[PDB]
Write a protein that binds this ligand. Sequence first.
Ligand SMILES: NCc1ccc(CNC(=O)[C@@H]2CCCN2C(=O)[C@H](N)Cc2ccccc2)cc1
Ligand SMILES: [Ca+2]
Length: 223
Amino acid sequence: IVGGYTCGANTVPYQVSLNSGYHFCGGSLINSQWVVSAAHCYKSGIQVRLGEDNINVVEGNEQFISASKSIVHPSYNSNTLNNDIMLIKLKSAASLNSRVASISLPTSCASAGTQCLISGWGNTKSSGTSYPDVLKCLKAPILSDSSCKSAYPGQITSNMFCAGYLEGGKDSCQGDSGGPVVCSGKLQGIVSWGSGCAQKNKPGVYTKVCNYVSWIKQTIASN
Ligand SMILES: NCc1ccc(CNC(=O)[C@@H]2CCCN2C(=O)[C@H](N)Cc2ccccc2)cc1
Ligand SMILES: [Ca+2]
């Protein structure tokens, strides 16, 4: 997250860190047994880390649980990142409490102009690299689909939306991948892609979760 703020420990209790020896992606807890992340975060050997603030220090509220199954969306296209969503089932159910809590799925999409909360442990610099160890947060509005398509001609589908600031300075970034965009209490986005970070006229692109709620619910119920 570039241009954000330190969230505060466990103030985003649905935020998970996916660990394969190191943090490599965010995700969102949607019930005691299931995490949603980006399909471009897919790999084997995932451990889900809940209740994290400093990902390098055991602070006392963590739960570390291995994934039993990963399900990349059937229509994911790695060339374009269309349908960039994946479900991860935990080997054992998380113990839900005030620092480890699910986020509600949308019953409808969000509109342009809605303010959202984006969070993660990704890069905090727009030029260069600096990775924080505590969770960073950013308030950012959903941008119009027309401004999104003008920023990235040819590349935006109905399964994507832009959020952030066309002036630059405030954005998600590498390492935030797979993490949440929450608006009015609902998980509306997943950190997906973009050109650089916090550059002018290059906002972040996010998987449009509301298009996937039926698939999420039916997949969880059948697995
Ligand atoms: N500042 C927002 C942001 C937040 C978080 C990220 C992390 N996401 C990526 O790194 C993805 C993974 C595949 C490659 N990516 C990319 O974005 C590529 N630069 C562009 C691309 C390539 C193929 C298909 C679609 C887009 C990036 C930008
Ligand atoms: Ca920790």
